């Protein structure tokens, strides 16, 4: 359907933002697990792949003794950024749907 | 990836965390006689550089090495 092609990009971006949000929250929740590696996804490459998931390990900053590589500050900033981008995607998708609607209303 | 302000402030947070970690490690090892090999502990320092991604305009803080 042509309607899907117009809204495909924003829907895929929104779904990818939700998945990465879940991954970041999993990183936050498992901060205290000894031996847990902080995982993340490269948003742009996966968005290419879906439009046309694989988890990448985060490069550790400080060496802990229990093997936990989760850094609070980095993932807190990433979490806030992902929340903001999810809201922006919701706004853009809603604007596109509302425009398609006011075209029809009459 | 990150918005510019997010990246700058998060880099600042990470750099301050690294400096605090270095200070805490130094304060812990204030009375250490030997390391794991047989050499004295040497006080660590952290050097802040400006991560000027564009030409001389702005940029957060990075830490080259301890």
């Amino acid at each position: 359907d042509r309607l899907d092609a117009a809204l495909r990009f924003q829907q895929e971006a929104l779904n990818l933002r939700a998945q990465r949000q879940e991954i970041l929250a999993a990183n936050i929740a498992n901060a205290d697990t000894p031996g847990y590696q902080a995982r993340d996804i490269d948003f742009a490459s996966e968005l290419k792949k879906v439009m046309v998931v694989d988890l990448l390990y985060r490069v550790p900053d400080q060496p802990s003794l229990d093997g936990n590589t989760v850094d609070m500050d980095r993932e807190r900033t990433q979490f806030a950024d992902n929340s903001l981008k999810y809201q922006m995607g919701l706004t853009v998708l809603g604007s596109q749907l509302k425009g398609m609607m006011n075209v029809l209303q009459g | 990836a990150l918005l510019n302000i997010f990246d700058i402030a998060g880099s600042a947070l990470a750099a301050q965390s690294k400096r605090l970690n270095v200070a805490a490690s130094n304060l812990a090892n204030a009375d250490s006689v030997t390391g794991p090999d047989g050499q004295p502990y040497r006080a660590k320092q952290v050097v802040f550089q400006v991560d000027a991604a564009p030409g001389q305009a702005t940029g957060g803080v990075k830490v080259a090495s301890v």
Binding site: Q37, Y57, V59, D66 | P36
Partner: peptide, 21 residues
């Protein structure tokens, strides 16, 4: 490379021995 980047390899285990092996 940079702390906070993305790599396809898990970091090596964080061992801290008390004496030289």
């Amino acid at each position: 490379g940079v702390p906070g980047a993305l790599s396809n390899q898990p970091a090596p285990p964080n061992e801290a021995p008390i004496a030289t092996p």
